[PDB]
Amino acid sequence: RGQVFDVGPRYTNLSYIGEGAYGMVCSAYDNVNKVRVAIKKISPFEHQTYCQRTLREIKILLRFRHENIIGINDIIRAPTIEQMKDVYIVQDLMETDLYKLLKTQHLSNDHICYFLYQILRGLKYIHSANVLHRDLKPSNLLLNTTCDLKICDFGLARVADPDHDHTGFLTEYVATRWYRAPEIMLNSKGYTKSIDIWSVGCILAEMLSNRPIFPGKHYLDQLNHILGILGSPSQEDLNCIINLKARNYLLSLPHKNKVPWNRLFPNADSKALDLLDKMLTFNPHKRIEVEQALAHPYLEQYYDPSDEPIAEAPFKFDMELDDLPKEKLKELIFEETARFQPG
């Protein structure tokens, strides 16, 4: 989605950055703030899925205000719904992301520590709003040249719903395979906060070695990669999987002993590995919570709960947007973007 790039007179001296899952991304000079910013041209109005994700992201990002979550500084669009055919989203310029950094750069322990702190600080706010991100991974963590980290891509986000999380074995799932918690493949729809903690643990492992820890090649391969490192689940953890197809799949597998974290990550700080172990815990009920992770000894130099804000306005709104005709989705996008119009 990119050809014309008409961002009015405020933004000039445009440079192409790339394509995304919505359209085209450029940098531009903000003649009001006198800084270079990122601008995304979104052309979603042809497909239900793009419109749903666009509405979801705009609604969430306009409600959230946090240093470790990307914000929206401005939205440019036509003054009427009839003329609205693109939407331009203006954001702070972030020169890289963790995916790109990990392909070429070794991270010092101090950087791993700082990045993890920022991820968890942002996630604390998201979770305090009763929101689940559900697609945390290196490419959804933006960084600027001073190492400020901001979480992005709320296209798969949902309101937490633990009472309706249960599903059968092998239920289809959308979020990126390598960062899926084991329970997704067994009995979970990904409607609890523990699914995001698993993804952070995978990101931590990837920061330690520059390689994905569980690079499954297919849906069930993801689970087998996890079990190849964690070892076979204990009787106690298996008794928490009540659905027979999932239980009996696990019981059919050969016994595997746990691979020690220090053999996988021989150069890692021992406190980092202790926290990694608690994030990559098989049983989601025993898995560490975001605030316990912030309080872990590994992060003691940064931990400051009074400087780790929570949301004022937790979500009870609709982020499913599934039973809405495209006409109403377009109208809702128009209404959500109205605050940036001169009027």
Ligand SMILES: O=c1ccoc2cc(O)cc(O)c12
């Ligand atoms: O460079 C970027 C590439 C894609 O997504 C972004 C999102 C932002 O909010 C800020 C950015 O600079 C980028």
